[PDB]
Scaffold this motif. Structure first.
Motif, PDB file in Angstrom:
ATOM      1  N   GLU A   1      13.272  44.296 -24.606  1.00 46.85           N
ATOM      2  CA  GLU A   1      12.892  43.128 -23.820  1.00 46.85           C
ATOM      3  C   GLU A   1      11.936  42.253 -24.617  1.00 46.85           C
ATOM      4  O   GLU A   1      12.155  41.052 -24.762  1.00 46.85           O
ATOM      5  CB  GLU A   1      12.246  43.538 -22.495  1.00 46.85           C
ATOM      6  N   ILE A   2      10.880  42.870 -25.139  1.00 48.01           N
ATOM      7  CA  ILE A   2       9.861  42.165 -25.911  1.00 48.01           C
ATOM      8  C   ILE A   2      10.454  41.465 -27.140  1.00 48.01           C
ATOM      9  O   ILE A   2      10.106  40.321 -27.435  1.00 48.01           O
ATOM     10  CB  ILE A   2       8.740  43.133 -26.347  1.00 48.01           C
ATOM     11  N   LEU A   3      11.358  42.145 -27.842  1.00 47.62           N
ATOM     12  CA  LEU A   3      12.042  41.546 -28.988  1.00 47.62           C
ATOM     13  C   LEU A   3      12.943  40.393 -28.555  1.00 47.62           C
ATOM     14  O   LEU A   3      13.056  39.386 -29.250  1.00 47.62           O
ATOM     15  CB  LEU A   3      12.875  42.587 -29.736  1.00 47.62           C
TER      16      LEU A   3
ATOM     17  N   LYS B   1      -1.664  49.263 -37.961  1.00 49.09           N
ATOM     18  CA  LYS B   1      -0.527  50.172 -38.007  1.00 49.09           C
ATOM     19  C   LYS B   1       0.669  49.615 -37.239  1.00 49.09           C
ATOM     20  O   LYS B   1       1.803  49.688 -37.712  1.00 49.09           O
ATOM     21  CB  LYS B   1      -0.923  51.545 -37.455  1.00 49.09           C
ATOM     22  N   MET B   2       0.417  49.062 -36.056  1.00 50.99           N
ATOM     23  CA  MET B   2       1.487  48.501 -35.236  1.00 50.99           C
ATOM     24  C   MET B   2       2.122  47.293 -35.918  1.00 50.99           C
ATOM     25  O   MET B   2       3.329  47.074 -35.821  1.00 50.99           O
ATOM     26  CB  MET B   2       0.964  48.103 -33.853  1.00 50.99           C
TER      27      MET B   2
ATOM     28  N   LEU C   1       4.672  48.301 -38.456  1.00 46.26           N
ATOM     29  CA  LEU C   1       5.909  48.715 -37.805  1.00 46.26           C
ATOM     30  C   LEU C   1       6.741  47.507 -37.406  1.00 46.26           C
ATOM     31  O   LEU C   1       7.968  47.558 -37.427  1.00 46.26           O
ATOM     32  CB  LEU C   1       5.618  49.579 -36.581  1.00 46.26           C
ATOM     33  N   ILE C   2       6.065  46.423 -37.035  1.00 46.65           N
ATOM     34  CA  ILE C   2       6.743  45.175 -36.700  1.00 46.65           C
ATOM     35  C   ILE C   2       7.566  44.692 -37.887  1.00 46.65           C
ATOM     36  O   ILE C   2       8.749  44.379 -37.750  1.00 46.65           O
ATOM     37  CB  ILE C   2       5.751  44.067 -36.291  1.00 46.65           C
ATOM     38  N   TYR C   3       6.926  44.648 -39.051  1.00 44.41           N
ATOM     39  CA  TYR C   3       7.581  44.244 -40.286  1.00 44.41           C
ATOM     40  C   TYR C   3       8.757  45.149 -40.618  1.00 44.41           C
ATOM     41  O   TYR C   3       9.797  44.684 -41.077  1.00 44.41           O
ATOM     42  CB  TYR C   3       6.581  44.252 -41.438  1.00 44.41           C
ATOM     43  N   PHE C   4       8.582  46.447 -40.385  1.00 43.84           N
ATOM     44  CA  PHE C   4       9.627  47.423 -40.660  1.00 43.84           C
ATOM     45  C   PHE C   4      10.859  47.142 -39.807  1.00 43.84           C
ATOM     46  O   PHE C   4      11.983  47.166 -40.305  1.00 43.84           O
ATOM     47  CB  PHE C   4       9.111  48.845 -40.416  1.00 43.84           C
ATOM     48  N   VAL C   5      10.641  46.858 -38.524  1.00 47.99           N
ATOM     49  CA  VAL C   5      11.738  46.537 -37.615  1.00 47.99           C
ATOM     50  C   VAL C   5      12.316  45.162 -37.941  1.00 47.99           C
ATOM     51  O   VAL C   5      13.534  44.972 -37.928  1.00 47.99           O
ATOM     52  CB  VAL C   5      11.286  46.575 -36.140  1.00 47.99           C
ATOM     53  N   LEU C   6      11.440  44.210 -38.249  1.00 42.31           N
ATOM     54  CA  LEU C   6      11.862  42.867 -38.636  1.00 42.31           C
ATOM     55  C   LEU C   6      12.678  42.880 -39.925  1.00 42.31           C
ATOM     56  O   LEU C   6      13.474  41.974 -40.169  1.00 42.31           O
ATOM     57  CB  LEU C   6      10.652  41.946 -38.803  1.00 42.31           C
ATOM     58  N   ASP C   7      12.474  43.908 -40.745  1.00 42.57           N
ATOM     59  CA  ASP C   7      13.216  44.060 -41.990  1.00 42.57           C
ATOM     60  C   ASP C   7      14.560  44.741 -41.773  1.00 42.57           C
ATOM     61  O   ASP C   7      15.539  44.397 -42.424  1.00 42.57           O
ATOM     62  CB  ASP C   7      12.397  44.846 -43.012  1.00 42.57           C
TER      63      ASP C   7
ATOM     64  N   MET D   1       2.184  37.529 -28.465  1.00 41.87           N
ATOM     65  CA  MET D   1       2.905  38.222 -27.405  1.00 41.87           C
ATOM     66  C   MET D   1       3.329  39.617 -27.850  1.00 41.87           C
ATOM     67  O   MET D   1       3.204  40.580 -27.092  1.00 41.87           O
ATOM     68  CB  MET D   1       4.132  37.416 -26.976  1.00 41.87           C
ATOM     69  N   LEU D   2       3.826  39.714 -29.080  1.00 38.37           N
ATOM     70  CA  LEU D   2       4.223  40.995 -29.658  1.00 38.37           C
ATOM     71  C   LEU D   2       3.074  41.984 -29.626  1.00 38.37           C
ATOM     72  O   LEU D   2       3.227  43.115 -29.175  1.00 38.37           O
ATOM     73  CB  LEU D   2       4.703  40.814 -31.098  1.00 38.37           C
ATOM     74  N   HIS D   3       1.921  41.539 -30.112  1.00 35.00           N
ATOM     75  CA  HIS D   3       0.712  42.350 -30.132  1.00 35.00           C
ATOM     76  C   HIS D   3       0.338  42.834 -28.729  1.00 35.00           C
ATOM     77  O   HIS D   3       0.138  44.027 -28.509  1.00 35.00           O
ATOM     78  CB  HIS D   3      -0.434  41.549 -30.760  1.00 35.00           C
ATOM     79  N   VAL D   4       0.270  41.905 -27.782  1.00 33.32           N
ATOM     80  CA  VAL D   4      -0.145  42.228 -26.422  1.00 33.32           C
ATOM     81  C   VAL D   4       0.898  43.034 -25.655  1.00 33.32           C
ATOM     82  O   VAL D   4       0.583  44.074 -25.078  1.00 33.32           O
ATOM     83  CB  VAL D   4      -0.464  40.956 -25.621  1.00 33.32           C
ATOM     84  N   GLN D   5       2.138  42.555 -25.648  1.00 30.60           N
ATOM     85  CA  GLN D   5       3.181  43.178 -24.840  1.00 30.60           C
ATOM     86  C   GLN D   5       3.516  44.594 -25.298  1.00 30.60           C
ATOM     87  O   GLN D   5       3.892  45.436 -24.484  1.00 30.60           O
ATOM     88  CB  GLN D   5       4.443  42.314 -24.838  1.00 30.60           C
ATOM     89  N   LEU D   6       3.373  44.863 -26.592  1.00 36.26           N
ATOM     90  CA  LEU D   6       3.637  46.201 -27.114  1.00 36.26           C
ATOM     91  C   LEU D   6       2.477  47.151 -26.846  1.00 36.26           C
ATOM     92  O   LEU D   6       2.686  48.287 -26.420  1.00 36.26           O
ATOM     93  CB  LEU D   6       3.930  46.152 -28.611  1.00 36.26           C
ATOM     94  N   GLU D   7       1.260  46.681 -27.103  1.00 36.62           N
ATOM     95  CA  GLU D   7       0.055  47.472 -26.865  1.00 36.62           C
ATOM     96  C   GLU D   7      -0.019  47.924 -25.411  1.00 36.62           C
ATOM     97  O   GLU D   7      -0.459  49.035 -25.112  1.00 36.62           O
ATOM     98  CB  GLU D   7      -1.190  46.663 -27.235  1.00 36.62           C
TER      99      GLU D   7
END
Lengths: 1488, 64
Positions: free
Chosen positions: A1166-1168, A1208-1209, A1212-1218, A1236-1242
């Protein structure tokens, strides 16, 4: 020596000229001339200049005749004797001895004319009457004494005969019979006498003219030679001289002994021809007086000049057979005197009738008489009679048989002095027979040395009498007598003498001048070899070829054995020094001069073949083999020529690297046809020279058997072959023999080859322990050795080795040594060494430049230029590549392909950024560079990597191939969805485990092989281990154990950190690559870690802790260790935040709740969906790339309560974005709302962490690669509180689990059989004190337990401790390797759990690209299921705090396992990293 | 403050591959010693058998 001759020729010309002028002055001064005549007679005889002897006799004969013309007849007579005795073996006392002198090649040119001169003097001194019975004897056998000279002065001889008839007072009839004979036989005019010839015939039949007195005996011999010429003519009959009653009554007296006993003759003179037959036959029917009559008979037969007849020769054989039959029956010495008398007159007959084979019989009778009588007198007569045959027969070929004959003579002599006396009869100048060739001189003297001289047993120099200078040089050349006055001889003679020996301490009229060139190149060759140099090797080879060998037909002469052995040595030395160009030219030249050098062609063919092979001219080499193999056969060849033919076929390139074909030939074929090429025990007792050559053959075969085996995946048998080769080489050296230069050179090449091969085999399997041994062994032999080409070759080999093991200090040294060693050899003639030199010094253009200069227009026929391309890394065309070097070619192709592909991808910023990004392989669910092109080029790269055979790779290359195979799969699975996605990762998983498994496997096998294999003149395959290693993984995955198996490896290619996880419970395989480049690479972290360890280690040493005493220096010690302890913490922190940030969750033992995760996965996508530009603007949700579950889980394993949570999070964003990027989903970071990524995932993570069920794995197995071992991974914060043990491979782990029915943690009883060693060297008193109490308390209440305290344990004591205990602890230095060898621990199959407390017990020494070794691996190979040790050196107080807490927390109730206990005990140390991070565990976790 | 100690560094029992026998100096000596190639390769008595079947002017001309 010419000014010497010109001086004496001057004197002779003065004499012969002024003597004729004034005869009075010269007579008194004749002494000066006799001096000069003798002076040159000696020189010319000593230097073998026979041709000048003739020209001297002419001037000497001219002196004699001018003495006669001036009536100095006295001098003239003693001059005839002077001339004769200077130029003949036989000596003369009077002119009688000259007149009866036999013809030999020494007097052929003057003997008859000399005799005529003698008769002239006898006549002029009126001594005819006294010389009468000798002159009658002379002409009686004129066919022997005079009628042998073809240029005989006819008119002068007959005129002499006529003048003797004129003055004689008796036998005037006999001189006329000969005169009429010589006139008709030699066509001559009778008008040298007015009265007619018919009246001359009748004028001799007077009463006073037929008067012969007692010389009536010769009447028959003269009449025969007269009438036989004059048959059918005016023949003076016999009845004209002798009346009827005196001729007829002869026949009638015979019909009715019967010999004149007092006169050594028969009763009758002038016996008829047929009447003799009834006399001869009558004598065959027959103590000691019987020998007397046998004399009278044969004495008369000589006196009667009857031509050779069968009836006479038949009785001759009957006579001599009777003589030999009854030698023993002769007891007294009067009968012995008669024996020598008869055997003397019988031998005279042979020379008259020219019966050489019948003379040989008489010689044997004299010999037999000598032995039976034990008479040296007879033996001397025997030897002299044989030499008489030699001169008279005039054959050089017969001379070989007479030497063997003389061998029997010398062995029969009754004393040592008598033996030498007999020898001098043989070793005589006149046995040369005026032969002016070097071949005959050598053949004669060496034969006489082998067969005769060695029977003399002399230890001092004896100048053998009447022998030449040349003869002494050659003879004593082969001796071993120390003090030989060679300085007296000519330089040419000395030069042969020196070459014949091993010592070198250095005239136009000489025989050796004809061989000046040859003699001095042999000297120069042997001179170089003794100095161990090649300063003239090139020059003398070209010199011998052009200025001698090519002038072979010009010289037109049979080749000496002097030259033969030189060729055999030159070819050998050229071969040994790799002058392969010159070897080819020489060998081809010899083969062209077959007319003379045919006997040496088998040598030329051997060294020509090895020449082509040395220059890799395989096309020519292969043609030569097929010719040789079909021409010559082995069943009839000599062992020497057989050894040479077999030794040339041993090279690998001749068999297309076909091991089975090679084994068939040298194993079955060759031994069936010529078994004594394999008789290393010398059962057939060969000469010591040949026996060594046989031993050398088998050494060379075993060495080559190794090269084929190792190039066929038979590492074990290859090792066994190399060991066999070295064991034979040892037995060869210990043979009590003076090692010939030829065999020494051959053995030097074989022995070094053996060391080279041994090291290369252990490099391939990565055994640094063995490589280090053989390296030092080799390095030791070189030290004392002086052979430049051997030394350079070895220094060059060691340099390559030190590069592999990265020993830079030894690397630099040996490079300098090799460079200096290279000056000591010819760079122009030795291309194989030259290229090696140019390779070492990075001069590659010059390397291929010097190749084209060397070969020129022969470059098409050599693989050497292509071979150096393979060495440089190039790959060559398959069709032009040698089948043997095809493996190296394929490997080079693989790396070259990869370099070109990676290069073209890295110029596209898309892939440039992909290699610099964290990559996973199961990441998603299934200029500008083209995508399909990239996929294609990678699927080709992948299929090529799968094509190569794994048993053709050294372990380091297999390591590269595996990490290159994984990288391709990783890049490909991020770009598309490959066929068979999972099975590819499974195999690739077990591929990377082979380089971990094989070195440990070889180590175990090699230490347990039987020793009897090495002394008798098991194998593993990568195939069966490939099955084993992929099955080991299949078993781990199917055990369904609740554990994580995480490997930590380093990639040489990329420099990436390679992590791989295995989850038996989840049935999941994952792998990721971490681009490491606050920033430090993997090598930079290693350099920083080693720097700390090395400093902390040398602070620990007793060398330092002893010298510290002051309170102020205690501070310096602690301050330094305080700092080192901080330097490491910060190092581990950099590693902690740079290499693993964001992927630490990969190590988390936490297993997610399945029901909650699926809920989080909804929110996650959803967040992505809401924040990613590509998912907000393009396609629909059913076209979105799905991320694998284990990646999604990495977020849930984050802790929001941690301080660096966002860091750290974000990673992981970059890893998924890659993951999305590479699969084709572009998301400009400029357009991504990271807020939003930072907040919604945390938020969603926290919602999970507060509702999650806390379950987790039981244990974590780290598969730490040998290059990552030195790192204290268990002290990283995310691994600190985990249950961890290390393991070297999947196979090792799966074995350990399969062994114990897959039950964790391993239970081990503690109620009995426990071993313990405490303070073995008494260097840990404080340590001993704390544990002394508890240990002895245990063994008191523990049956079959033991303790060794303050006592150095014997090897066979702890060997049964390790194998017969439930627990083994040890507190000292290391792992007790100073009390037990590595071999014996590795020989065990089961070992008790070991607690190797103490310094560096888990440390390993590293050797570059070879596998490192330590006592930690030694225990594991012994069967140990759990071994605990320290990675470096520790101090006692801290480590003993640890040891105490370790034992307490483990229960040595619900005590802790060894894993938890250790991790919960690290905190007791004051230095928590310098000491606390040191302990480590390998194997399975145990509990008491 | 008192200093912690460490055990004395020991030499591990020498490793030799199985059955290997090093070349002693007597052996190396034989390997580097040049000997002449031309050096040649290192008693009852029986009897021998028998096989079966002028003026001064003519003197000069005499030597010239």
């Amino acid at each position: 020596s010419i000014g010497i001759l010109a001086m004496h020729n001057n004197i002779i010309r003065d004499f012969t000229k002024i003597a004729s002028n004034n005869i009075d002055l010269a007579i008194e001064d004749i002494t000066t001339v006799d001096h000069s005549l003798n002076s040159i007679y000696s020189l010319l005889k000593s230097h073998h200049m026979w041709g000048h002897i003739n020209s001297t006799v002419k001037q000497h004969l001219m002196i004699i005749v001018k003495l006669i013309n001036n009536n100095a007849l006295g001098l003239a007579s003693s001059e005839i004797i002077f001339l004769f005795n200077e130029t003949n073996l036989f000596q003369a006392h009077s002119l009688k001895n000259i007149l009866l002198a036999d013809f030999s090649t020494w007097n052929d040119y003057y003997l008859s004319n000399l005799k005529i001169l003698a008769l002239q003097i006898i006549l002029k001194r009126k001594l005819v009457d006294e010389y009468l019975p000798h002159i009658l004897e002379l002409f009686s056998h004129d066919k022997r004494y005079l009628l042998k000279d073809p240029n005989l002065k006819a008119h002068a001889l007959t005129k002499i005969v006529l003048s003797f008839f004129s003055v004689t007072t008796s036998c005037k009839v006999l001189f006329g019979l000969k005169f009429l004979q010589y006139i008709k036989q030699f066509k001559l005019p009778f008008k040298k006498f007015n009265i007619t010839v018919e009246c001359f015939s009748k004028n001799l039949l007077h009463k006073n003219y037929l008067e012969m007195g007692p010389n009536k005996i010769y009447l028959n011999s003269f009449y025969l030679s007269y009438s036989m010429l004059y048959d059918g003519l005016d023949k003076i009959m016999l009845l004209d001289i002798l009346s009827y009653e005196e001729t007829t009554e002869v026949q009638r007296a015979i019909k009715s002994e019967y010999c004149n006993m007092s006169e050594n003759r028969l009763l009758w003179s002038c016996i008829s021809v047929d009447d003799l037959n009834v006399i001869l036959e009558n004598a065959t029917n027959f103590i000691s007086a019987t020998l007397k009559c046998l004399v009278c008979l044969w004495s008369t037969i000589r006196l009667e000049g009857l031509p050779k007849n069968k009836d006479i020769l038949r009785q001759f054989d009957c006579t001599v057979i009777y003589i030999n039959s009854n030698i023993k029956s002769i007891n007294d010495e009067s009968a012995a005197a008669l024996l020598s008398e008869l055997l003397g007159v019988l031998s005279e007959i042979c020379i008259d009738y020219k019966e050489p084979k019948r003379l040989s019989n008489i010689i044997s009778v004299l010999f037999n008489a000598s032995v039976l009588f034990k008479s040296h007198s007879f033996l001397l007569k025997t030897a002299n009679l044989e030499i008489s045959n030699v001169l008279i027969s005039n054959d050089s070929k017969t001379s070989h048989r007479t030497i063997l004959k003389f061998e029997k003579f010398i062995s029969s002599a009754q004393s040592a002095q008598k033996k030498i006396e007999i020898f001098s009869c043989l070793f005589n100048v006149y046995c040369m027979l005026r032969n002016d060739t070097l071949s005959f001189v050598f053949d004669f003297c060496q034969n006489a040395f082998i067969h005769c001289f060695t029977r003399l047993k002399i230890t001092k120099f004896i100048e053998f009498s009447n022998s030449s200078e040349i003869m002494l040089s050659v003879l004593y050349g082969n001796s071993s007598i120390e003090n030989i006055p060679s300085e007296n001889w000519s330089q040419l003679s000395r030069m042969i003498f020196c070459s014949l020996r091993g010592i070198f301490d250095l005239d136009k009229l000489h025989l050796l001048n004809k061989y000046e060139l040859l003699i001095r190149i042999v000297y120069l060759l042997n001179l170089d070899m003794s100095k161990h140099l090649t300063t003239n090797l090139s020059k003398i080879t070209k010199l011998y070829i052009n200025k001698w060998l090519q002038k072979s037909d010009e010289k037109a002469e049979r080749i000496s054995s002097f030259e033969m052995d030189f060729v055999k040595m030159l070819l050998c030395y050229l071969n040994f020094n790799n002058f392969d160009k010159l070897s080819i030219e020489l060998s081809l030249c010899i083969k062209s001069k077959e007319k003379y050098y045919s006997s040496i062609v088998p040598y030329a063919d051997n060294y020509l073949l090895e020449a082509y092979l040395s220059l890799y001219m395989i096309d020519d080499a292969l043609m030569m083999k097929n010719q040789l193999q079909k021409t010559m056969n082995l069943s009839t060849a000599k062992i020497e020529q057989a050894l040479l033919h077999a030794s040339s076929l041993i090279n690998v390139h001749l068999w297309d690297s076909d091991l089975t074909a090679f084994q068939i030939y040298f194993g079955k074929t060759l031994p069936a046809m010529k078994p004594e090429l394999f008789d290393i025990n010398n059962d057939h007792n060969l000469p010591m020279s040949l026996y060594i050559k046989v031993i050398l053959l088998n050494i060379k075969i075993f060495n080559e058997s190794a090269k084929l085996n190792i190039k066929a995946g038979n590492v074990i048998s290859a090792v066994i072959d190399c060991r066999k080769a070295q064991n034979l080489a040892l037995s060869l050296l210990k043979k009590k023999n003076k090692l010939s230069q030829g065999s020494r050179l051959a053995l030097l090449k074989s022995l070094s080859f053996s060391f080279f091969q041994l090291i290369k085999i252990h490099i391939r399997i990565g055994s640094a322990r063995d490589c280090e041994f053989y390296s030092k062994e080799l390095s030791r032999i070189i030290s004392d050795l002086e052979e430049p080409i051997i030394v350079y070759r070895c220094l060059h080999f060691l340099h390559r080795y030190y590069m592999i093991t990265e020993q830079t200090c030894l690397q630099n040294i040996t490079l300098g040594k090799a460079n200096k060693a290279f000056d000591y050899l010819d760079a122009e003639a030795d291309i194989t060494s030259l290229t090696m030199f140019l390779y070492d010094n990075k001069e590659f253009v010059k390397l291929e430049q010097s190749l084209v200069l060397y070969f020129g227009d022969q470059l098409e026929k050599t693989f050497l230029p292509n071979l150096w391309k393979l060495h440089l890394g190039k790959d060559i065309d398959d069709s032009i590549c040698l089948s043997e070097y095809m493996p190296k070619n394929v490997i080079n192709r693989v790396h070259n392909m990869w370099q070109k592909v990676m290069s073209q991808l890295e110029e596209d910023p898309f892939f440039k950024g992909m290699f610099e990004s964290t990559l996973g392989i199961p990441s998603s669910l299934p200029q500008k560079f083209d995508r399909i092109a990239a996929i294609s080029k990678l699927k080709q790269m992948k299929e090529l990597l799968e094509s190569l055979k794994l048993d053709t790779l050294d372990n380091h290359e297999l390591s590269k191939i595996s990490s290159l195979s994984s990288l391709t799969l990783t890049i490909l699975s991020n770009i598309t969805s490959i066929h068979n996605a999972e099975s590819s990762l499974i195999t690739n998983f077990s591929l990377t485990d082979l380089p971990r498994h094989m070195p440990l496997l070889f180590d175990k096998v090699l230490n347990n092989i039987d020793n009897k294999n090495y002394r008798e003149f098991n194998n593993i395959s990568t195939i069966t281990e490939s099955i084993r290693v992929s099955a080991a993984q299949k078993d781990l995955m199917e055990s369904n154990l609740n554990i994580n198996v995480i490997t930590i490896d380093f990639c040489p290619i990329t420099g990436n950190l390679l992590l791989s996880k295995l989850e038996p419970r989840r049935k999941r395989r994952t792998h990721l690559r971490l681009p490491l480049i606050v920033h430090l690479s993997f090598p930079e972290a290693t350099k920083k870690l080693l720097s700390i360890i090395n400093e902390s280690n040398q602070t620990t040493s007793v060398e330092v802790t002893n010298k510290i005493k002051t309170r102020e220096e205690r501070k310096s010690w602690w301050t330094t260790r305080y700092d080192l302890d901080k330097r490491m913490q910060q190092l581990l922190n950099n590693i902690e935040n740079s290499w693993f940030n964001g992927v630490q969750g990969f190590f988390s033992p936490e297993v997610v709740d399945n029901s909650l995760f699926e809920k989080f996965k909804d929110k996650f996508y959803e967040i992505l969906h809401q924040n990613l530009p590509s998912r907000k603007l393009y396609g629909n949700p059913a076209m979105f790339i799905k991320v694998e579950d284990w990646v999604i889980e990495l977020f849930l394993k984050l802790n929001p309560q941690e301080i660096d949570f966002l860091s750290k999070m974000e990673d992981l964003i970059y890893f998924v974005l890659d993951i999305l990027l590479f699969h084709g989903e572009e998301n400009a970071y400029d357009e991504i709302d990271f807020s939003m990524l930072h907040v919604q995932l945390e938020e969603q993570i926290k919602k999970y962490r507060a509702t999650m069920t806390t379950n987790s794995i039981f244990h974590t197995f780290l598969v730490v690669s040998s290059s990552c071992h030195l790192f204290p991974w268990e002290c990283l914060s995310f691994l600190k509180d985990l249950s961890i043990t290390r393991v070297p491979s999947y196979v090792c782990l799966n074995k350990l689990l399969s062994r114990f029915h897959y039950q964790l943690p391993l239970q081990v009883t503690i109620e009995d059989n426990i071993s313990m060693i405490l303070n073995p060297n008494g260097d840990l008193s404080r340590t001993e004190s704390k544990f002394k109490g508890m240990f002895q308390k245990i063994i008191d209440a523990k049956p079959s337990s033991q303790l060794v305290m303050n006592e150095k344990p014997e090897e066979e004591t702890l060997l049964k401790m390790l194998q017969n205990s439930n627990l083994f602890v040890y507190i000292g230095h290391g792992g007790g390797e100073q009390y037990v060898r590595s071999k014996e621990i590795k020989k065990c199959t089961k070992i008790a759990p070991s607690f190797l407390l103490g310094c560096s017990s888990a440390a390993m020494k590293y050797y570059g690209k070879l596998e490192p070794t330590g006592t930690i691996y030694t225990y594991l190979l012994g069967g140990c299921p759990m071994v605990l040790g320290n990675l470096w050196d520790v101090t006692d107080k801290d480590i003993d705090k640890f040891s105490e807490e370790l034992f307490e927390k483990m229960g040595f109730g619900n005590s802790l396992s060894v894993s938890y206990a250790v991790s919960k005990s690290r905190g007791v140390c004051h230095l928590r990293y310098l000491n606390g991070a040191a302990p480590v565990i390998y194997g399975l976790p145990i509990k008491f | 403050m008192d200093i912690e100690i460490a055990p004395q560094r020991q030499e591990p029992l020498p490793y030799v591959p199985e059955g290997y026998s090093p070349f002693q100096q007597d052996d190396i000596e034989k390997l580097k010693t040049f000997n002449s190639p031309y050096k040649l390769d290192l008693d009852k008595v029986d009897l021998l058998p028998l096989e079966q079947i002028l003026d001064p002017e003519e003197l000069e001309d005499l030597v010239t």
